[PDB]
């Protein structure tokens, strides 16, 4: 899409409708005449365009109105309402831009943001842009959170997020023009090498891949058309539905063999009965012929009854001889059918040990995408966010994806090595208690109007709590936290002195020997300028490789690679790093997934702010004081960087409306 329509699409907005959000800020317009809505819709789409065409400079309301043109540059307050709505909710003037109008020396309100992750940084940068006082509390010695980047010398490799999932409607597309990010395309050609190290032949590779995709689509059929979504009062997982679908296909193979063979016995039996007719006819013809001979032996001249007996037996013999001839003709047809029916017998297996092993690699792929064993994903909902996928190829960041957080974090008050330990929110404001990670004795107290929490879902899940809420979070929020899933996947980064792989392939697989170890180093990435090869640990393997020493883990990598390129072309690696995210106390996992028994509605529960009760009883109900952002709070874009960033922009808009006031609703 191009034009002003492209601006709406590139802002994840319908170009010809008003969203639920705009209905709320402009209820006059949505309930008004259609002509005015087109005017609004145009003014919105146009303003978005102006921002997108140059996102390195602030888009003032004046510059916006000047480059509008009649009748659209007529109602100046409608334009001022549109620009103000878009600025507030981070659809324009978000990210890193040059401020035309410098921010006011006098701030307003105080916000403490927990976590300098992308969600935290995005909100912070926005609030500061709105004239508030923001301070971020960070437990680590760096920003970024799950956006980690190994750097030593020229070696660069992301242990965290490393892929930009298409730029078609991606807010990262704006950050990419605002930050010098080296975006590189990813070639989808992934060759699978089996346990021995021999490339899987292409024909087998395509039918397993085809079958895998068929199996998936099958589960969706079980879910939606057959309502196979509860089993024994427990919710069905994707893994269970795959097992049930594979079983029902292995059963069909067996059914179709029985039906085939059991149709050989159908004919072999009517063959048997044909022979018994023919072996008796042959004995009746053996006996009549003998009688005819004896009647023929009485030499003529004979009385007519003896002439009758010859001509009669001769009749009867040719009669039965014509009968037997037909049965042999009929017997050949049955013999042909048996020759054919045996010739085309249906396949004896649905899948075999070699076939299934390659299927396991496609399941590890899924387990990688969702950072969790397929046994935990909700069957109904695991794919609830696929309608909002972006367009374009998937990218990787050549210079290290940390360049984004580090960039956002400038101009911001970040306290590093500051671990929040308690969060107190009252009707009159909030205090956050943190400590120094380097020495736990130093204690800090931060007072503020509002806390924005971007604590990873796995931190929120921790029992006993790493962070105490005073008063404790209500049962609806805690329950959503338990129901939701926080998965795990780890990376092993391998640094060599020389490229020994195919440089024209970005990624190649390894097929595990067992179902259990299907995730164990199942996939490798060649993404960077330096000779660095990245190897994934996913599925049930992820949480188990975290109890094994790095040297053993690197060993297993070397073994894999030797099997591929020979014990000669694989040197010892210069530099080795291995992720252990579930162990990492500021993550306690990798990213969120729709657990079985959860749904995408829990993601919206996560994002509801908390409103403390009144201090004096009988006092009017207060403002909400505790807000949440991060990857687990955005229903339509979870478990991604762009989704974190979007959630930051969201709360910052929400908090500002609550504290600075929304003057764009009138």
């Amino acid at each position: 899409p191009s034009g002003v329509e492209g601006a709406a699409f590139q802002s994840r907005l319908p170009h010809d409708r008003m969203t639920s959000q705009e209905a709320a800020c402009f209820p006059d317009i949505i309930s008004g005449p259609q002509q005015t809505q087109k005017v609004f819709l145009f003014i919105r789409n146009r303003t978005l365009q102006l921002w997108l065409d140059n996102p390195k400079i602030q888009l003032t309301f004046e510059a916006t109105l000047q480059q509008l043109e009649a009748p659209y540059n007529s109602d100046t307050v409608l334009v001022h309402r549109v620009h103000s709505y878009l600025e507030r909710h981070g659809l324009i003037n978000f990210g890193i831009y040059k401020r035309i109008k410098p921010l006011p020396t006098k701030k307003t309100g105080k916000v403490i943001i927990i976590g300098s992750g992308v969600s935290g940084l995005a909100a912070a940068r926005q609030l500061q842009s709105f004239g508030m006082d923001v301070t971020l509390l960070e437990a680590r010695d760096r920003v970024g959170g799950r956006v980690a980047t190994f750097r030593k010398g020229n070696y660069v490799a992301d242990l965290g997020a490393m892929v930009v999932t298409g730029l078609g409607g991606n807010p990262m597309a704006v950050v990419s023009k605002q930050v010098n990010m080296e975006l590189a395309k990813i070639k989808q050609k992934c060759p699978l090498y089996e346990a021995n190290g021999q490339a899987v032949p292409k024909e087998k590779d395509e039918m397993v891949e085809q079958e895998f995709n068929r199996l998936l689509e099958a589960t969706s059929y079980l879910s939606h058309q057959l309502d196979f979504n509860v089993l024994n009062n427990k919710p069905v997982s994707l893994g269970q539905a795959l097992e049930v679908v594979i079983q029902l296909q292995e059963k069909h193979v067996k059914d179709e063999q029985i039906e085939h063979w059991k149709k050989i016995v159908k004919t072999q039996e009517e063959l048997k009965e044909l022979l018994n007719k023919m072996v008796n006819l042959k004995e009746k013809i053996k006996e009549l012929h003998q009688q005819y001979k004896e009647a023929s032996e009485v030499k003529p001249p004979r009385d007519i009854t003896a002439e009758f007996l010859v001509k009669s037996k001769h009749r009867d013999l040719t009669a039965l001889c014509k009968e037997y001839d037909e049965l042999a003709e009929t017997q050949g047809k049955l013999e042909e059918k048996l020759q054919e029916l045996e010739a085309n017998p249906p396949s004896d297996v649905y899948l075999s040990s070699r076939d299934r092993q390659i299927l396991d690699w496609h399941f590890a792929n899924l387990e990688f995408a969702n950072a969790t064993p397929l046994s935990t994903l909700s069957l109904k909902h695991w794919d609830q966010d696929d309608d909002f996928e972006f367009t374009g190829s998937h990218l990787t960041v050549r210079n290290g994806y940390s360049c984004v957080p580090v960039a956002l974090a400038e101009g911001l008050d970040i306290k590093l090595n500051t671990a929040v330990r308690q969060v107190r929110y009252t009707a009159s404001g909030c205090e956050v208690i943190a400590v120094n990670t380097r020495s736990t004795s130093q204690t800090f107290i931060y007072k503020c109007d509002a806390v924005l929490c971007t604590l990873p879902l796995g931190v929120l899940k921790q029992q006993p709590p790493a962070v105490q809420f005073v008063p404790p979070l209500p049962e609806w929020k805690t329950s959503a936290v338990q129901r939701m899933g926080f998965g795990n996947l780890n990376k092993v980064v391998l640094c060599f002195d020389r490229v020994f792989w195919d440089p024209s392939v970005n990624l190649f697989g390894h097929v595990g020997s067992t179902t259990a170890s299907r995730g164990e180093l199942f996939l490798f990435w060649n993404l960077y300028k330096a000779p660095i090869l990245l190897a994934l640990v996913a599925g049930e393997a992820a949480g188990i490789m975290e109890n094994i020493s790095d040297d053993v883990i690197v060993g297993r990598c070397l073994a894999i690679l030797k099997g591929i390129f020979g014990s000669s072309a694989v040197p010892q690696p210069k530099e080795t790093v291995v992720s252990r995210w579930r162990a990492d106390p500021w993550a306690r996992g990798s990213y969120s997934y729709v657990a079985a028994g959860s749904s995408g509605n829990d993601y919206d529960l996560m994002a509801q702010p908390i409103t403390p009760g009144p201090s004096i009883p009988g006092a009017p109900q207060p403002i909400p004081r505790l807000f949440f952002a991060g990857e687990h709070t955005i229903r339509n874009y979870p478990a991604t960087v762009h989704g974190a960033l979007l959630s930051g922009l969201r709360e910052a808009g929400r908090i500002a409306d609550q504290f600075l006031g929304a003057m764009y609703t009138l």
Binding site: V163, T165, Q188, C190, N365, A369, D383, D386, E389, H394
Partner: peptide, 4 residues
């Protein structure tokens, strides 16, 4: 998302 299956991510290929």
């Amino acid at each position: 998302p299956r991510s290929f």
